[PDB]
Paper text:
In a nucleotide-free state, our cryo-EM analyses resolve two apo KpsMT conformations (Apo 1 and Apo 2). Apo 1 shows well-separated NBDs with minimal interactions mediated by TM5 between the KpsM subunits. In this conformation, the gap between TM1 and TM5 of opposing KpsM protomers creates a deep electropositive canyon that extends from the NBD into the transmembrane segment. The canyon ends near the periplasmic membrane surface at the interface between TM1 and a short periplasmic reentrant helix (PGH1) following TM5 of the opposing subunit.
Author numbering:
A (entry chain C): 14 to 268
B (entry chain F): 3 to 50, 72 to 176, 321 to 371
C (entry chain A): 1 to 11, 17 to 219
D (entry chain G): 5 to 50, 71 to 180, 319 to 371
E (entry chain H): 19 to 50, 71 to 180, 320 to 351
F (entry chain D): 163 to 217
The structure:
């Protein structure tokens, strides 16, 4: 057989296996995945509805929060579910066709599918209720989403390679994912921040990607200084190259 | 069970990719109609504010102004001329509410908080008609402001950018929309194919 | 034709380092040697579990993975999903995997609690389904490592019966410790120690080799 | 075919061809673009930020572009460099594309804390860039004065003025065509892309058995 | 590692030229809002017309090229106008304290007398520019804004910016 | 006493559930910011005052 059909068959098999184990019972995990964003939208709207109303008189809080949150859930899943993709399926590397990166890309594909489906149904629901649901620049939004997906997958693969023998490293990065949820401007708009802290926040690629996706989504959305796509694009490319090189080096060390 | 095996993924990619792109390409390159857009940028000042600009923004998308403009320039007759286009053509015998929604879709009003300048973009099927409608909107807006000031018991409209005469259509963007639909259809087909494969595997 | 070309594999003792070896064609060969001397690495590489850093093993015919590998089953999934997973990896057809799962569930005889994950699974039925899966695939070099079956007398009896039925037209590889079955099936022997391997046409020299060098 | 790709073919397709194309375009077919920079601010003479916002919007307008084209023949000037197809204004284009090109050539930046509007005008000759910047400044001042005049007349002498902190400077050398920096960063990006692609294809070929 | 240290040390202790710094501290006040004029002045110091006036006043082009053994900090002959402006911006440092509204001007130079003269010329040209910028709006209808000197320009005695030992230690860090 | 009591209670409850230990380790971090450790608490709008009175 061709060396590519084997990869396709292995990827399909691992995707089916991981979907089977991810959904507990008769697909009970999909309810959990659906109830995270509505709970988040409820608590944050109840808290800062008046805050956003005082922030800017052009965007309602549900849509702003949903397009700032679903991509971040995408990134957080692509970071968290990917480091555990190597140790959990350690026993499967005995069939002459399963490699460590195959489980990684299968987990990445399934995360992509699940979160994209969630984004689609949530956007449809928001449009059904009466809110804004059509992006003004769809191609730029797709490009930003692809860049964010590549960056998240690269970071996940890099962490899976690095912390194979160090579970405590996985623990501390799981701890540190939470401050990234607050320093990426997911909840509140970032232009209401003193400028002295502005350059220190320019080093976060996720903030750049979130702001650019919101700009491509909303009409006439103002973009402040230093939110170019070049920095997150280079960050993602460099991280992907580093992760692939590290996996190529530490390739035969995974049992 | 039988239905999932009926797709064979070939009719599936035909019905999720080939048919929508074929239909969209035919509509865009055959039946779509040009829509020239004229742009103006105005604001209101006293001849000696922000709230008056907000009142103007509300007034532009109102029904009294639409009635005045329909009596003056006959917008309803003009917007029904492109019989080739079934989507962006105002059909005959429509209701008042549908006419109002159509007019609100054609005329776009935007305001920024930092500068306080109100920009109006008026669509049409002729550059001359779009420019004329924009000029009429501006004239009626300044007349409304002056009448409000008079009946309150001395204001003027600052026209930073007068209405322009467009040279080519800009809004019926065919290739960008085709690429967007291609990306959307590819993603939808991939997701649907994966889901149908999963359910086909799980059912038996 | 299984042929070795200057194999090198780091496990800092170099277990195997740029040696070449040849193997007989259509002759029953069983790998034998001292435990921990490098035989486990050699049969794992023969089964394709790991690839050599230098050199290659070549064979024009496919090699079956070693039998009785409990690690090859995911704990959270039962036997049916695991067997369909591995057959999908091997790219079988629809009726193909229907036949394979039917054969493996007939061989298991664990129809009650058949769809039970490996987390709450006894060792006996785990070994039964492992042997059934390893038998369900059609090959001609079986890397049999540990025993043949787990159960009562009739379990091993019919396992050996079907093994002789399926091996009589093919070739079988044994890496074990008891020499009764090696005398019964195997013909030629390769002995591995500290990275050097010696080939004996007759196991009679292998008996002396074990008595002296081990 | 995918399985028939070699390292040298990947290097030629990914790295070498864009390198040659970019080097040939930048070192031969690229046209110089001199920049004239000025810094202005509008204040009353007899709420200034309102007038600065009006000027910022009016500079990138179309009526100002119409006056500038009628005065200095911008369309004839910008179409002169034939050897550079990317940054030249092709003849017979649309009015909307002409406005987009003019908005791309002229950059307007604002310092709100200082309230200073800086205008950077690009041109293919330094004298033309300086003349365009001077004409833009004169037209902005005239527009502010005209607005004040009509606002005063609607109820029924220069009242507002535009101070020039820095007059339009005549450039000596081209600034915006950065051949070497662009070549270096594109080389780095291209090398990274080639490395990633080679690693991916090696990972794919790892499944050969 | 040893070769870069050798070449850096021999350049610093043999080839590097001294650069004297003169310091001034100013602010602008209405005699009879000041932040606006202060920011206008801050922009004006690094402008090009001011550099031109300084060039036909003090001939900075000749002075900055007088060293010959320090090619790193030398204004080479036949350089462009833009590079000359960048060099002048590098040589003259302007700092602003907003909580006090004070502008500090540090002028570099290979001779202390020329550095002090350059600082004084900058100060007087800034005062004249403020006066003229007010006067143009004054007579568009047809002496009120004075710049006070908290610290007048000083005459340095020793070089300050060629900190050889500190830069050598910083290179030793890397 | 409160800390030791909470530790003993969690050790008893989550003996067989390491994921429970993980999620409480996650949620310890927001408690570090909602306890007024960093910034003084009287510079907080009163509408959020009663909600913070439960800590």
């Amino acid at each position: 057989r061709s060396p590519w059909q084997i990869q396709q068959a292995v990827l399909f098999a691992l995707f089916l296996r991981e979907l089977k184990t991810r959904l507990g019972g008769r697909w009970l995990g999909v309810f959990w995945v659906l109830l995270e964003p509505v709970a988040h939208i409820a608590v944050m709207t109840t808290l800062f509805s008046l805050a956003h109303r005082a922030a800017m008189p052009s965007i309602e809080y549900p849509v702003f929060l949903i397009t700032g949150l679903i991509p971040f859930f995408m990134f957080r899943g692509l970071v968290t579910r990917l480091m555990e993709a190597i140790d959990s399926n350690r026993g499967l590397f005995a069939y002459r066709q399963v490699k460590p990166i195959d489980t990684v890309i299968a987990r990445a594909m399934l995360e992509i599918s699940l979160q994209s489906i969630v984004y689609l149904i949530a956007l449809g629901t928001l449009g059904w209720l009466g809110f804004h649901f059509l992006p003004v620049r769809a191609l730029e939004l797709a490009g930003v989403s692809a860049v964010l997906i590549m960056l998240g997958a690269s970071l996940g693969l890099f962490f899976a390679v690095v912390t194979n023998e160090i579970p405590q490293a996985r623990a501390i990065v799981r701890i540190s994912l939470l401050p990234l949820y607050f320093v990426s401007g997911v909840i509140f708009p970032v232009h209401t921040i003193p400028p002295q802290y502005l350059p220190l926040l320019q080093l976060n690629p996720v903030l750049h990607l979130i702001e650019l996706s919101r700009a491509s989504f909303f009409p006439q959305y103002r973009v402040l200084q230093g939110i170019n796509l070049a920095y997150p694009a280079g960050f993602a490319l460099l991280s992907l190259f580093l992760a692939l090189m590290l996996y190529r080096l530490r390739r035969h060390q995974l049992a | 069970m039988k239905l999932v095996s009926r797709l064979t993924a070939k009719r599936l990619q035909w019905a999720l990719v080939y048919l929508p792109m074929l239909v969209a390409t035919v509509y865009f390159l055959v039946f779509s109609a040009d829509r020239y857009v004229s742009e103006s940028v105005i604001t209101v000042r006293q001849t000696s504010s922000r709230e008056d600009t907000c009142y103007l923004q509300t007034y532009i998308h109102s029904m009294g102004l639409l009635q005045k403009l329909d009596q003056q320039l006959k917008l309803r007759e003009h917007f029904g001329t492109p019989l080739r286009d079934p989507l962006f053509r105002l059909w005959g015998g429509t209701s008042q509410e549908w006419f109002l929604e159509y007019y609100r879709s054609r005329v776009e009003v935007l305001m920024d908080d930092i500068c306080g300048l109100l920009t109006v973009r008026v669509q049409g099927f002729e550059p001359e008609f779009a420019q004329a409608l924009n000029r009429a909107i501006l004239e009626e807006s300044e007349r409304f402001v002056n009448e409000l000031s008079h009946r309150m018991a001395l204001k003027s409209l600052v026209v930073v950018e007068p209405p322009v005469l467009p040279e080519i259509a800009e809004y019926p963007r065919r290739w960008y929309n085709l690429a967007t639909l291609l990306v959307v259809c590819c993603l939808i087909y991939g997701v649907v194919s994966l889901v149908v494969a999963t359910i086909r595997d799980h059912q038996d | 034709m299984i042929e070795l070309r200057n194999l090198t594999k780091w496990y800092r003792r170099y277990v195997f380092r740029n040696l070449n070896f040849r193997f007989p064609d259509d002759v029953s060969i069983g790998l034998i040697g001292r435990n921990g001397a490098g035989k486990s690495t050699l049969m794992r590489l023969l089964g394709g579990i790991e690839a050599p850093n230098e050199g290659e093993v070549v064979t024009d015919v496919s090699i079956s993975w070693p039998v009785g590998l409990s690690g090859g089953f995911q704990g959270s999934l039962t036997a049916r999903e695991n067997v369909k997973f591995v057959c999908r990896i091997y790219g079988t057809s629809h009726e193909d995997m229907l036949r394979k799962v039917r054969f493996v569930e007939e061989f298991a005889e664990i129809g009650e609690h058949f769809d039970l994950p490996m987390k709450t699974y006894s060792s006996g039925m785990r070994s039964r389904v492992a042997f059934g899966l390893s038998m369900a695939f059609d090959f001609d070099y079986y890397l049999i490592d540990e025993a043949m079956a787990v159960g009562d007398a009739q379990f091993r009896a019919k396992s050996r019966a079907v093994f002789d039925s399926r091996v009589g037209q093919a070739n079988m590889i044994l890496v074990s410790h008891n020499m009764n079955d090696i005398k019964e099936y195997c013909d030629v022997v390769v002995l591995v120690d500290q990275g050097q391997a010696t080939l004996y046409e007759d196991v009679e020299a292998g008996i002396a080799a074990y008595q002296g060098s081990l």
